[PDB]
Coordinates of C-alpha atoms and ligand atoms in Angstrom, one line a residue:
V1 CA -166.3 -58.6 -115.2
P2 CA -168.4 -58.9 -118.8
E3 CA -169.8 -55.4 -119.2
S4 CA -173.7 -56.9 -119.2
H5 CA -172.8 -57.5 -115.1
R6 CA -171.1 -54.0 -114.9
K7 CA -174.7 -52.0 -114.5
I8 CA -176.1 -54.6 -112.3
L9 CA -173.1 -54.4 -109.8
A10 CA -173.2 -50.7 -110.0
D11 CA -176.6 -51.2 -108.3
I12 CA -175.6 -53.5 -105.6
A13 CA -175.1 -52.1 -102.3
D14 CA -171.9 -50.5 -101.5
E15 CA -171.6 -52.5 -98.4
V16 CA -171.6 -55.9 -100.1
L17 CA -169.1 -54.8 -102.8
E18 CA -166.6 -53.8 -100.2
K19 CA -166.9 -56.6 -97.6
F20 CA -166.9 -59.2 -100.3
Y21 CA -164.3 -62.3 -99.7
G22 CA -162.7 -63.2 -102.9
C23 CA -163.4 -63.2 -106.5
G24 CA -166.4 -63.6 -108.5
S25 CA -168.3 -66.3 -109.5
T26 CA -168.3 -66.7 -113.3
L27 CA -172.0 -67.5 -114.8
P28 CA -172.9 -69.1 -118.1
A29 CA -174.4 -67.2 -120.5
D30 CA -176.7 -64.1 -119.2
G31 CA -179.3 -65.3 -121.1
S32 CA -179.5 -69.1 -120.2
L33 CA -180.1 -68.1 -116.4
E34 CA -183.9 -67.0 -117.0
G35 CA -186.0 -68.6 -114.7
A36 CA -183.4 -70.8 -113.1
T37 CA -182.5 -71.6 -109.8
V38 CA -178.9 -70.7 -108.5
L39 CA -176.7 -71.6 -105.8
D40 CA -173.7 -70.4 -105.0
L41 CA -171.0 -72.1 -102.8
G42 CA -169.2 -69.8 -100.5
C43 CA -171.2 -67.0 -101.2
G44 CA -169.5 -64.5 -98.6
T45 CA -171.7 -61.0 -98.3
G46 CA -173.6 -61.8 -101.7
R47 CA -172.2 -60.0 -104.5
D48 CA -172.6 -62.9 -106.8
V49 CA -176.1 -64.0 -105.3
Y50 CA -177.2 -60.4 -106.0
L51 CA -175.9 -60.2 -109.7
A52 CA -177.6 -63.7 -110.1
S53 CA -180.8 -62.5 -108.7
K54 CA -181.2 -59.8 -111.4
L55 CA -180.1 -61.8 -114.2
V56 CA -182.8 -65.0 -113.2
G57 CA -185.6 -62.6 -113.0
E58 CA -188.4 -62.7 -110.6
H59 CA -189.1 -66.8 -111.9
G60 CA -185.9 -67.7 -111.2
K61 CA -184.3 -67.9 -107.3
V62 CA -180.8 -67.9 -106.3
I63 CA -179.5 -69.6 -103.0
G64 CA -175.9 -68.3 -101.1
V65 CA -174.3 -70.6 -98.7
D66 CA -171.8 -69.7 -96.6
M67 CA -170.1 -70.6 -93.1
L68 CA -168.7 -67.0 -92.4
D69 CA -170.8 -65.2 -89.8
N70 CA -170.0 -61.6 -90.7
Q71 CA -170.3 -62.4 -94.6
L72 CA -173.6 -63.5 -94.1
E73 CA -175.0 -61.3 -91.6
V74 CA -174.1 -58.4 -94.2
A75 CA -175.6 -60.5 -96.9
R76 CA -178.7 -61.1 -95.1
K77 CA -179.3 -57.3 -94.7
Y78 CA -179.8 -56.4 -98.1
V79 CA -182.7 -59.0 -99.0
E80 CA -185.2 -56.3 -99.5
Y81 CA -182.8 -53.7 -100.6
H82 CA -182.2 -55.5 -104.0
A83 CA -185.6 -56.8 -104.3
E84 CA -186.6 -52.8 -104.4
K85 CA -183.7 -52.3 -106.6
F86 CA -184.5 -55.3 -109.1
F87 CA -188.0 -56.1 -108.9
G88 CA -189.4 -52.7 -107.4
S89 CA -190.8 -54.0 -103.9
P90 CA -188.8 -54.6 -100.8
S91 CA -191.3 -58.4 -100.3
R92 CA -190.3 -59.3 -104.0
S93 CA -186.7 -61.1 -103.0
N94 CA -186.0 -64.0 -105.1
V95 CA -182.7 -65.2 -102.9
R96 CA -181.8 -66.6 -99.7
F97 CA -179.0 -67.1 -97.5
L98 CA -178.1 -70.3 -95.3
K99 CA -175.3 -71.2 -93.0
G100 CA -173.6 -74.1 -93.5
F101 CA -170.5 -76.2 -94.7
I102 CA -170.7 -76.7 -98.1
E103 CA -169.8 -80.0 -97.6
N104 CA -173.2 -81.1 -96.4
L105 CA -176.0 -78.5 -97.9
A106 CA -178.8 -80.9 -96.5
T107 CA -178.2 -79.5 -92.9
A108 CA -177.9 -75.5 -93.7
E109 CA -179.6 -73.2 -91.5
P110 CA -182.8 -72.0 -91.6
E111 CA -183.0 -74.8 -94.1
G112 CA -181.5 -77.5 -96.3
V113 CA -180.8 -77.8 -100.0
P114 CA -183.2 -80.5 -101.4
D115 CA -182.4 -83.0 -103.6
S116 CA -182.8 -82.4 -107.2
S117 CA -183.8 -78.3 -106.7
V118 CA -181.1 -76.7 -107.9
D119 CA -180.6 -75.6 -111.9
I120 CA -176.6 -74.2 -111.7
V121 CA -174.3 -75.0 -109.0
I122 CA -171.5 -72.0 -109.3
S123 CA -168.5 -71.3 -107.1
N124 CA -165.0 -69.8 -107.6
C125 CA -161.8 -71.3 -105.8
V126 CA -163.5 -73.6 -103.0
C127 CA -162.6 -76.7 -103.5
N128 CA -158.8 -76.9 -102.5
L129 CA -159.8 -75.5 -98.9
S130 CA -162.7 -78.2 -98.8
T131 CA -162.4 -80.6 -96.2
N132 CA -163.4 -83.5 -98.6
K133 CA -163.6 -83.0 -101.9
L134 CA -165.4 -86.2 -103.0
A135 CA -168.3 -85.5 -100.5
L136 CA -168.6 -81.9 -101.6
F137 CA -169.0 -83.5 -105.1
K138 CA -171.4 -85.7 -104.1
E139 CA -173.7 -83.0 -102.3
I140 CA -173.3 -81.0 -105.6
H141 CA -174.7 -84.2 -107.8
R142 CA -177.4 -84.5 -104.9
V143 CA -179.1 -80.9 -105.2
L144 CA -178.5 -80.8 -109.3
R145 CA -181.9 -81.6 -110.8
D146 CA -181.6 -83.6 -113.9
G147 CA -180.1 -81.3 -116.4
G148 CA -178.6 -79.1 -114.2
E149 CA -174.8 -78.3 -114.2
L150 CA -172.2 -77.2 -112.0
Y151 CA -170.1 -74.6 -113.6
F152 CA -167.2 -73.8 -111.7
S153 CA -163.9 -72.4 -111.4
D154 CA -160.9 -73.5 -109.3
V155 CA -157.4 -74.7 -109.4
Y156 CA -155.8 -77.6 -110.8
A157 CA -152.3 -79.0 -111.5
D158 CA -151.0 -80.6 -114.1
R159 CA -149.4 -83.1 -111.7
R160 CA -149.5 -84.9 -108.4
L161 CA -148.4 -82.5 -105.6
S162 CA -145.6 -83.8 -103.0
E163 CA -146.5 -84.3 -99.6
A164 CA -144.5 -81.3 -98.6
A165 CA -146.1 -79.1 -100.7
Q166 CA -149.6 -80.3 -99.5
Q167 CA -148.4 -79.6 -96.1
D168 CA -147.1 -76.3 -96.6
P169 CA -149.5 -73.4 -95.0
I170 CA -149.1 -70.9 -97.3
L171 CA -149.8 -73.4 -100.6
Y172 CA -152.6 -74.3 -98.7
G173 CA -153.9 -70.5 -98.4
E174 CA -153.5 -69.7 -101.7
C175 CA -155.4 -72.8 -103.1
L176 CA -152.5 -74.3 -104.4
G177 CA -151.6 -76.8 -102.1
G178 CA -154.9 -78.7 -102.3
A179 CA -155.1 -78.4 -105.9
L180 CA -155.9 -82.1 -107.6
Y181 CA -153.9 -83.2 -110.6
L182 CA -156.3 -82.7 -113.4
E183 CA -156.7 -86.9 -114.4
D184 CA -157.6 -86.9 -110.4
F185 CA -160.1 -84.4 -110.5
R186 CA -161.6 -86.1 -113.6
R187 CA -161.8 -89.7 -111.7
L188 CA -163.1 -88.2 -109.0
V189 CA -166.0 -86.2 -110.0
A190 CA -166.9 -89.3 -112.0
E191 CA -167.2 -91.1 -108.8
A192 CA -169.6 -88.3 -107.4
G193 CA -171.5 -88.8 -110.5
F194 CA -170.3 -86.5 -113.2
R195 CA -169.4 -88.6 -116.2
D196 CA -168.4 -85.9 -119.1
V197 CA -166.4 -82.9 -117.9
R198 CA -166.5 -79.6 -120.4
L199 CA -163.8 -77.4 -120.3
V200 CA -165.0 -73.6 -120.8
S201 CA -162.0 -71.6 -120.1
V202 CA -158.8 -71.9 -118.7
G203 CA -155.8 -69.3 -117.5
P204 CA -152.2 -70.0 -116.2
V205 CA -151.7 -69.5 -112.3
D206 CA -148.0 -68.5 -111.6
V207 CA -145.9 -69.3 -108.2
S208 CA -143.1 -66.9 -108.6
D209 CA -141.4 -66.5 -104.9
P210 CA -138.6 -69.1 -104.9
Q211 CA -139.1 -70.9 -101.8
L212 CA -142.6 -71.8 -102.6
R213 CA -141.6 -72.8 -106.2
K214 CA -139.0 -74.9 -104.9
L215 CA -141.6 -77.2 -103.2
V216 CA -143.4 -77.5 -106.5
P217 CA -140.7 -77.0 -108.9
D218 CA -142.2 -77.8 -112.2
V219 CA -146.0 -78.1 -111.6
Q220 CA -147.9 -76.1 -114.1
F221 CA -151.1 -74.6 -112.1
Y222 CA -154.1 -73.2 -114.0
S223 CA -157.4 -71.6 -113.2
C224 CA -159.8 -74.0 -115.2
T225 CA -163.5 -73.2 -115.2
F226 CA -165.5 -76.7 -116.4
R227 CA -169.0 -77.1 -116.7
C228 CA -170.3 -80.5 -115.5
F229 CA -173.8 -81.7 -116.2
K230 CA -176.3 -84.1 -114.5
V231 CA -177.8 -86.1 -116.9
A232 CA -178.8 -89.9 -116.6
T233 CA -178.0 -91.0 -120.2
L234 CA -174.1 -89.3 -120.4
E235 CA -171.6 -92.3 -121.3
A236 CA -168.1 -92.1 -120.3
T237 CA -167.1 -91.5 -124.1
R238 CA -168.0 -89.3 -127.0
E239 CA -170.2 -91.4 -129.2
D240 CA -171.4 -90.2 -132.5
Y241 CA -175.2 -91.4 -133.3
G242 CA -175.2 -89.2 -136.8
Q243 CA -176.4 -86.3 -134.9
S244 CA -176.5 -82.2 -135.7
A245 CA -177.8 -79.6 -133.2
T246 CA -179.0 -76.3 -134.3
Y247 CA -179.0 -73.3 -131.9
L248 CA -182.3 -71.1 -132.6
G249 CA -181.1 -68.0 -131.0
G250 CA -182.5 -65.7 -128.7
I251 CA -179.6 -65.6 -126.1
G252 CA -176.8 -64.3 -128.0
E253 CA -175.5 -64.3 -131.7
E254 CA -174.1 -68.0 -130.9
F255 CA -173.8 -70.1 -128.2
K256 CA -170.7 -71.7 -126.9
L257 CA -170.9 -74.7 -124.9
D258 CA -167.4 -75.4 -124.4
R259 CA -164.1 -75.1 -125.9
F260 CA -165.0 -77.7 -128.3
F261 CA -168.7 -76.7 -129.5
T262 CA -169.7 -73.3 -130.4
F263 CA -173.4 -73.2 -132.2
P264 CA -173.9 -70.0 -134.3
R265 CA -177.5 -69.1 -134.8
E266 CA -179.5 -71.5 -137.3
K267 CA -176.5 -73.3 -138.6
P268 CA -176.4 -77.4 -137.9
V269 CA -173.4 -78.4 -136.4
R270 CA -172.7 -82.1 -136.0
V271 CA -172.7 -83.2 -132.3
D272 CA -171.7 -86.4 -130.3
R273 CA -174.2 -88.1 -128.3
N274 CA -173.3 -86.6 -124.6
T275 CA -173.6 -83.4 -126.3
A276 CA -176.9 -83.9 -127.8
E277 CA -178.2 -85.1 -124.4
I278 CA -177.2 -82.5 -122.4
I279 CA -178.8 -80.0 -124.8
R280 CA -181.9 -82.0 -124.8
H281 CA -182.1 -82.6 -121.0
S282 CA -180.7 -79.5 -119.6
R283 CA -182.3 -75.8 -119.8
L284 CA -180.9 -75.2 -123.0
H285 CA -182.9 -77.2 -125.1
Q286 CA -185.2 -73.9 -124.8
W287 CA -182.8 -72.5 -127.8
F288 CA -181.9 -75.7 -129.6
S289 CA -182.9 -78.1 -132.0
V290 CA -181.5 -81.4 -132.2
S291 CA -181.7 -84.5 -134.3
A292 CA -182.8 -87.7 -134.0
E293 CA -180.3 -90.3 -133.0
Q294 CA -179.5 -92.6 -135.5
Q295 CA -177.4 -96.0 -135.5
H296 CA -174.1 -95.8 -134.1
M297 CA -171.4 -94.5 -136.0
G298 CA -168.4 -95.0 -133.7
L299 CA -166.1 -92.7 -132.0
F300 CA -167.3 -89.1 -132.7
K301 CA -165.0 -87.4 -135.1
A302 CA -167.0 -84.7 -136.6
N303 CA -164.9 -81.7 -135.2
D304 CA -161.8 -79.9 -136.3
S305 CA -160.3 -80.9 -132.7
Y306 CA -161.7 -84.2 -132.5
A307 CA -158.4 -85.7 -131.3
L308 CA -158.3 -83.7 -128.4
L309 CA -162.3 -84.0 -127.4
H310 CA -161.4 -87.5 -126.5
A311 CA -158.0 -86.9 -125.0
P312 CA -157.0 -86.3 -121.5
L313 CA -158.0 -83.2 -119.5
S314 CA -154.5 -82.2 -119.4
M315 CA -153.8 -82.1 -122.8
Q316 CA -157.1 -80.3 -123.4
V317 CA -156.2 -77.5 -121.2
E318 CA -152.5 -77.7 -122.2
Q319 CA -153.5 -76.6 -125.5
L320 CA -156.3 -74.5 -125.1
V321 CA -153.8 -72.3 -122.8
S322 CA -151.1 -72.4 -126.0
Ligands
ARS1 AS1 -159.0 -70.0 -103.4
CA2 CA1 -167.6 -67.0 -103.9
CA3 CA1 -147.3 -80.0 -118.5
CL4 CL1 -156.8 -68.7 -104.3

């Protein structure tokens, strides 16, 4: 738990913390959250929705979605509580909780999530129990506005699991059985409309039970945090148009977009055009200066890890854990 969140969680209702299902949804840098609309898929009792509530401030909004009756009941009891806590009045809530399958946000209750209405979709470990990943990714793409991002953590595999592993109920409940191979994930999310997957962080996930490991003997599992922007002008490849981006300051000493691009305050950093377009069309533009496109210069190589930048996801992930 990041320090900047600790004081806010101390202010969140003990019943929300005590009954919360799962691990916290990871968030983009606090400063970038100001005024955003955030949607948490599988919000549980609302721990992350309330944390985001504060971080987005009074001009932001947070929406939580879940299908667990008891979780939501708890969530919905503390709306006034946290409005008082954060904003000073019980009537000043910027959160709402909706009941529904994450696969179809359009028909949640009391209301659905409309097209192009969300800046950030967050979630932690929801995909491998999803009933239909493609449909889930398509629904995320639908609700995001242009320049919005899916910023999420989940478990992935370095190879395709066997049928036997995919049928095992303990592997399934542990979010391993339903894990995609990293390249299959890349193709699936691209079919849903996310043409550029950026690796934020990765940790190893171990299967130590020797019985279960026999179903996935040499499989390496990872918990990966990815950010996938919805930006109309993204291409499948990372092309150089001679651009630089300069982080202007104001949401930290430096801005780390992903494991390839770190932007120190007031220093120009060469960027491929996808990265430029992400900065320009997303909410991040507020804190950046991005130079004009020149003539195409070929594949983007002005990065000290440009080889890995263009490589398959499995190589990026495997090398970042090293
Ligand atoms: As999970
Ligand atoms: Ca959750
Ligand atoms: Ca491997
Ligand atoms: Cl899990």
